[PDB]
Predict the structure.
Amino acid sequence: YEHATTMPSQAGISYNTIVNRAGYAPLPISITPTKIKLIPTVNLEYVTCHYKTGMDSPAIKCCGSQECTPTYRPDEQCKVFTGVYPFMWGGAYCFCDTENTQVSKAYVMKSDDCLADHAEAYKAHTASVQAFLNITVGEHSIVTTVYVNGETPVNFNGVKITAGPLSTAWTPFDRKIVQYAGEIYNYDFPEYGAGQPGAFGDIQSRTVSSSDLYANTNLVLQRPKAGAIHVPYTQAPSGFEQWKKDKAPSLKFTAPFGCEIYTNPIRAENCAVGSIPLAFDIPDALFTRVSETPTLSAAECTLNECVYSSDFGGIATVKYSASKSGKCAVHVPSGTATLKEAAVELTEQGSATIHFSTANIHPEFRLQICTSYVTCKGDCHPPKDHIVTHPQYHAQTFTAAVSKTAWTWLTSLLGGSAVIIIIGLVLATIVAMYVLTNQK
Amino acid sequence: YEHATTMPSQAGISYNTIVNRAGYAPLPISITPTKIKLIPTVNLEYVTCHYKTGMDSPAIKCCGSQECTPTYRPDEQCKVFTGVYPFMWGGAYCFCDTENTQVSKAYVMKSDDCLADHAEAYKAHTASVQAFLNITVGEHSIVTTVYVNGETPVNFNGVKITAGPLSTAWTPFDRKIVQYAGEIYNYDFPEYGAGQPGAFGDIQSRTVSSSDLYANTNLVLQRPKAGAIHVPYTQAPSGFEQWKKDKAPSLKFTAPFGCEIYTNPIRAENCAVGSIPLAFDIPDALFTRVSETPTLSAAECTLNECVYSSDFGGIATVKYSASKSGKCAVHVPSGTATLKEAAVELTEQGSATIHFSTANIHPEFRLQICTSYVTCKGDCHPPKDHIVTHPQYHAQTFTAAVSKTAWTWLTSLLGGSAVIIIIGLVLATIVAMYVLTNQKHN
Amino acid sequence: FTVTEKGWEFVWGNHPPKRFWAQETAPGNPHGLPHEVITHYYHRYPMSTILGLSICAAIATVSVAASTWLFCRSRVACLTPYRLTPNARIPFCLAVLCCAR
């Protein structure tokens, strides 16, 4: 039996509905989403970190000449300086005045702290929403991870439930993502081999232990001081440190729809966007006959209290006369008012108390208790807190808070004008007929 | 110098071009694609294999009554049978005639050969194209795996090449894929927990070593034969074996555009579809000046051989004169002829012998040699083979084989009718003016 | 089997795949005797040939018909002012040109 329904994508707030089979007992359904994940397909392109300019020891030949032997190290420079007179702690090194020769060699290598301090540059596409539900279908209750593509069913007690795909393909992530220290950034990093010095990705290693890094750090060798053995060099400073200095805040602070960016894998949680359609395939054995359930006669609904707050602020008292004592479903068909509980246990002659929640100043909603339909009618009052710390448990109907006095003002100002213009048109027609009568 | 061009997506065939900076020497560029992969984003759901109905030994109590204690094994059926008089080899087992009890218990576990003989059910989407180019820009050659997204450049000798995305989002792989034994099938397998008895996926193990398998194999326990200790069952046969008996052929034999499906990365090869665009960010240092290259004077082109076959079945011959002895590029700017080599090494008074390929019956193209333009004109003839074992090395232009005789028949029988209608219109106009002149008389 | 210019491939048992490619060697001669060029371009380009011959026959028929129409209307417009005179002395030059009595 196919029963299609649609649940708003928002964690924590319970969703209640019933299946009204035409000659069998009403079947309750209660679905409370706990955690709605959103996982993009994520592809590592490189890593980056601080660098470390490696230097070679100076090769000095006393009254000779030297040549450049390339080691093919990353961003490797090798300039050879003539006319040197170097020094050690034990006096002069060479003994000539000119024609000594010193070779400087510098190169870039990734840092020693690369393993525990580095940024991972990913690419994101094609999210895959997944949800921790908690499903109760006719006092059969499970807690099961669902995959909310339009297939991959969840099976319990012969019921086959399939959570349809999201009505929106929104993702908080861009096409390009940087992860640094538990925090994720929509950042347009340069491609591998396209790194510029002094910016992000001047060091590009393909994996963390790749043993092949791309270095574009603007390393230039300088000429050493007279009487000193050292390798002087000039280069643009580290762009991973400058990127840490810039760092517009993480995606857990700037993402819309209330999303919560986590990374054991990269995911967003509890975004309040879209809505999950549901598909119920209920078998024909769960439908109990009507005569094995309680059924009421002479039931009546009165509103005790009524506040059009955001939580459950309305108490209605239903006085009944039951044929049998047992629990049965309560439900409201419209989104006029949302009840708190999905079932009410009955005595045979008692009076039941239900908790509901409405935005209506003047609510007139038709309850559905076990198989009958009573009409709850009353007036709500404004709450006292301006700002609450829990979201909205009901729906915002258009023209829900019109407050009957303003219905009277709108109906007067909109109907008296129409009355006056139709009596003017009738008077014009009667005057025309009276002219045609008098011209005889 | 930003230079953009376009390359057809076809392996093996060399693609040649040049770059003409307006006052410098022409810089030849050659790209020969070798192996062009297509690797989808592949997502394992479950594996399956043959099942193996395991059976516990029958619990027998004499003048008693057993009970059913479940174990929550996959598809674990259990039933208690009363009125049983079993036999062993050494005589009867009970002394009681009735009120004896035998319990049958069966369950489904996966087979012992599940490791080396299983089929992987995947999901694929949003593939990734990746080629093994062999680029030569100004006699400086590299062999590099380029990625053909719109970025991720290959860098060599200061030259930046970005081979942009394919013109087509076609993939041979469907949304669902089964891999079995090195071959890949487009099969619509059921989801996890939706496996049906008798067909593919009646066993659904999440991974190979998951130790929690879904099984729906229609197992039903049956009553044992009177006087025997066995566990009789009746179930639908192996859906994996029934899938293997049917097995519409692999994607290796059925794929459009002639793809070559492989296994260990799931990938397709050499699918001749689409075209790769290219971006060349060339530094200004490579542009050699004019007078550091040879430059012809009084050149002339003749055609020796001309067959419009599939490969290089034309030979043009250029007699030239130039006051240096070096190599220079040759190129045909139209797609009329596809040349074989990209450069010709020159003497000062010799001749050049180039090899081109064409679809035309009356080829008239303008050959570009070192910095000049000669006109190579001739007549090609049909080739001798109907069917060759190599693809085409040229581009079929519309109106390529129109055969000047048929140009004459289309010029006469269509342009001559226009001559008939205009002389009829002129005759009608002269007649109307002469009638008006005759009626000017009154 | 029919092999086109786009390719063809078969596998015979445990043999490797053999790819084949058709090239443009059509029966006929494209250089003369105009019933030979039509068979050549019919075996060569089958769909385009019938459309080309249809539109060339249609334009030739419309052109010959409209030219005959205009010439007969101009002959009528010439000879009518000399056939309403009751003596009908059509001059000699228009008798030779417009093919009169």
User: Anything to note?
Assistant: The longest strand of chain B covers residues 119-137. The first helix of chain B runs from residue 239 to 246.
